[PDB]
């Protein structure tokens, strides 16, 4: 199932993500440079998110170009964000013009891939299945990807012969 | 290679399409109803196109909802369009929420698929390789797909094990 | 649909191959050196075949290592083969140790691929859908592939998302 | 990378399996009826194994048709197997006549799939990368699969576009 995900918007999946589902976020541009304008916020941050029916952010994926890092986290609806889990940003992107972030669902954790190469395993923190995805950025900034992304949801059986 | 193709725009491929290349046009919405407003033009038409370096339209794919048909054609740069080749529109789309148009290149013709089911073989008319793709509609109308499409270019070797 | 195809045997398909079906013959070995022994025919020949319900060989694909070329033909049941259609063997295989022959069906012709690169388009000569495949060799010789091949039958939709 | 795996034999891989590698064991047949004969062991057992460079069985996957379950274990070279880990056999196969067992590698564990549906996560016990695979059966019995299996080694990137 394909979805069009515009910058600063949220899109509903067609159904809750089943066990071992796979979500691919596809860009047609790469920009690893700091945003021209920092904007009111004061922090260079663009992110994609997996959200449940209640509005909780099961997985938050932030790209911090001025900090050279990927920030993973979870955010209960209307509450503060938990402890951050970070890893270096350099050396993950930069190999192709259409960068992508792939998420592989497992019972207790999320497998995260950059341009199809696993870079981290994030332990789940909040309850409930993914039913929405969002693409957000702090006011006045410019993203590290195209301002519109292609999002595909599929299962291993799909990318293998048969129906 | 993934590309983001916005309504009423043209995007350059990263390189001329090689023999037996495959181009997939992906929408996340389907609307088989006549456009609300016909607009100045007076014809309900939305189309996608394969274009060469010189600006000639090697393959034109128009969807005519009020005529219940698919119109295939070619258009030399700055010249009149040739003879139309048409087939019924009903029964091709309507099986899924994310409709797609796939084009399979062959030496002398283009294999055209709707939602991955072949519906026609169009004989090539103009010379030169595909290097651009466009998504167009007549002024004031609303498309039968999302106003942004995902376009992927690949080769058979890609969708099969190995590198 | 996967099938095991042993040298000098014929295997039935699950059902008649439908329009645009794809058949992939996989080997885990490549040996382009000519067969040491030639047996009673005096001609180095190993072939794979697509057969219809009444015994007609719809498409015969031979590998002639002593003549540097592929040989394509059709053979009505109980009759003699028709005219041969050839292309060079050199420059097709070579870039892998697990070679494959892929046939992509079309209304009036067969698209043939070596290691997933199209090398020829064979115009159909007989009627009826393919219902069996075979792997044969001339008496007393050794083949250029493993003595057992993996055969997969699928369709374009199977290698693309959802449904 | 494709490999032919005959019953009661061991086959080497092209190179040590890298992080996140995927190994697919394919059969063209399914027979869950118990083996008519049991031979000297008196236990109906057919298995597939992932082996390292020094003879250690990193992962042993057994099918016990008389005990209704899969048996997972590890076996250091020259030593005795460790504790068994089981799950029911019933309800895993069944929806195809060409069954497959897929192993997806992870840093600390193996994700196991039957017909492309995850059924278990086995925690690694031994060191070293997988360099060989084998297909074995207890003396005098007949297996639940074809006597020859097709084995494919690949990576996630291989089943996704470009590079």
């Amino acid at each position: 199932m394909f979805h069009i995900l515009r910058l600063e918007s949220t899109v509903d999946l067609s159904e809750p993500l089943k066990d071992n589902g796979i979500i691919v976020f596809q860009s047609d541009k790469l920009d690893l440079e700091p945003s021209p304008n920092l904007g009111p916020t004061g922090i260079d941050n663009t992110n994609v998110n997996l959200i449940n029916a209640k509005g909780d952010v099961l997985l938050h994926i932030g790209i911090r170009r001025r900090e050279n890092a990927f920030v993973f986290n979870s955010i209960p609806y209307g509450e503060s964000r938990g402890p951050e889990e970070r890893i270096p940003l350099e050396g993950t992107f930069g190999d192709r013009r259409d960068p992508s972030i792939t998420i592989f669902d497992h019972p207790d954790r999320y497998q995260i891939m950059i341009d199809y190469k696993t870079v981290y395993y994030y332990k789940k923190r909040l309850e409930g299945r993914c039913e929405k995805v969002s693409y957000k950025i702090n006011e006045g900034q410019t993203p590290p990807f195209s301002d519109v992304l292609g999002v595909t949801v599929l299962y291993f059986a799909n990318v293998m012969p048969r129906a």
Side-chain angles (χ1 to χ4, degrees), chain A:
Chain A
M1 178 64 84
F2 182 72
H3 296 283
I4 288 288
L5 178 55
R6 306 171 178 69
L7 180 63
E8 279 297 306
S9 77
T10 307
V11 173
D12 293 325
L13 296 185
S14 66
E15 62 176 38
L17 185 69
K18 303 174 187 300
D19 295 334
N20 296 306
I22 308 169
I23 303 187
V24 183
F25 288 92
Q26 285 188 291
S27 179
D28 82 337
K29 295 195 184 308
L30 175 68
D31 182 339
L32 294 177
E33 304 274 38
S35 173
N37 306 308
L38 241 186
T41 179
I43 303 182
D44 200 315
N45 162 56
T46 293
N47 50 270
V48 297
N49 308 283
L50 299 197
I51 308 157
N52 65 25
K54 304 189 302 171
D56 302 310
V57 172
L58 311 175
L59 174 60
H60 172 88
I61 299 183
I63 300 169
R64 304 294 193 65
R65 288 169 292 174
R66 311 201 191 202
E67 294 168 53
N68 180 54
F70 270 111
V71 171
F72 305 112
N73 213 333
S74 290
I75 309 163
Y77 183 65
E79 289 175 44
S80 171
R81 51 163 164 89
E84 308 188 328
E85 288 178 54
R86 303 154 73 100
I87 66 179
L89 175 63
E90 190 185 63
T92 59
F93 287 117
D95 55 289
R96 53 187 299 167
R97 60 200 66 203
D98 47 339
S100 53
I101 300 176
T102 298
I103 305 173
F104 234 103
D105 174 85
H106 295 291
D108 61 340
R109 58 184 192 171
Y110 287 119
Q111 187 181 342
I112 300 157
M113 294 181 153
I114 301 298
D115 293 347
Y116 310 121
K117 300 193 218 69
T118 298
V119 304
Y120 200 69
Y121 283 95
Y122 182 87
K123 295 174 185 173
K124 292 181 175 179
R125 298 181 186 176
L126 309 173
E127 311 169 311
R129 288 178 178 291
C130 177
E131 283 175 51
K132 308 169 181 286
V133 298
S134 75
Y135 181 21
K136 304 293 188 61
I137 188 173
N138 291 331
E139 185 179 54
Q141 315 190 320
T142 301
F145 308 132
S146 36
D147 65 3
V148 181
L149 301 174
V151 176
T152 304
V153 178
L154 55 102
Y155 300 85
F156 205 71
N158 295 339
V159 293
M160 215 63 90
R162 203 87 343 259

